[PDB]
Specification:
Elements (H helix, E strand, L loop, with lengths): L50
The chain binds one RNA strand through loops.
Length: 50
RNA sequence: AGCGGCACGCGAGCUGGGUUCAGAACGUCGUGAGACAGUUCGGUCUCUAUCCGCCACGGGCGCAGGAGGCUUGAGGGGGGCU
């Protein structure tokens, strides 16, 4: 009952590949709905998404 | 009641609403410290311009006797609506 518990757990933290697919949402030309809130202009030391 | 470039023009010209500095809470994953382009309320922006560039006003020797006065125009700018 643990291998059907502690492996259902494992296949739902690989379910946070969703923040990979938001940069390419429509994947063709996503000038996306986060590209006006970046502050990443070489300074303002901020953690990137990758 | 246009489209586009000018380091997605412009912070040694000004603002700091946005997002991702330290505080705190909701949902969700984790036994746990913690975490999530998922949401929410708070958060320090620096008196003296050396050199090119620009806007206005000056000091010398020039135009081959020393001075006053009125002037032409090479060239360049502003103005152009409905």
């Amino acid at each position: 009952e643990l291998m059907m518990k502690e492996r259902e757990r494992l296949e739902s933290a690989v379910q946070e590949k969703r923040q990979q697919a938001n940069r390419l949402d429509n994947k063709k030309k996503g000038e996306k709905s986060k590209n006006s809130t970046e502050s990443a202009g070489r300074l303002g030391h901020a953690k990137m998404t990758g």
